[PDB]
Amino acid sequence: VCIGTPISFYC
Amino acid sequence: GGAGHVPEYF
């Protein structure tokens, strides 16, 4: 997936 | 927003 934290790196 | 590399924001 590409979710979990409201700030992160690219997908 | 994902989990790879390259920051989405600064």
Coordinates of N, CA and C in Angstrom, one line a residue, chain A:
Chain A
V1 N 0.8 -1.2 0.0 CA 0.0 0.0 0.0 C 0.9 1.3 0.0
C2 N 0.2 2.5 -0.1 CA 0.9 3.8 0.0 C 0.1 4.7 0.9
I3 N -0.1 4.3 2.2 CA -0.7 5.1 3.2 C -0.1 4.6 4.6
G4 N -0.4 5.4 5.6 CA 0.0 5.0 7.0 C 0.4 6.2 7.8
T5 N 1.3 7.1 7.3 CA 1.7 8.3 7.9 C 1.2 9.5 7.1
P6 N 0.8 10.7 7.7 CA 0.3 11.8 6.9 C 1.4 12.6 6.2
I7 N 2.7 12.4 6.6 CA 3.9 12.8 5.8 C 4.7 11.6 5.4
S8 N 5.2 11.5 4.2 CA 6.0 10.5 3.7 C 6.7 10.8 2.4
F9 N 7.4 9.7 1.9 CA 8.1 9.7 0.6 C 7.1 9.4 -0.5
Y10 N 7.4 9.6 -1.8 CA 6.7 9.1 -2.9 C 6.2 7.6 -2.9
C11 N 5.3 7.3 -3.8 CA 4.7 6.0 -4.0 C 5.3 5.3 -5.3

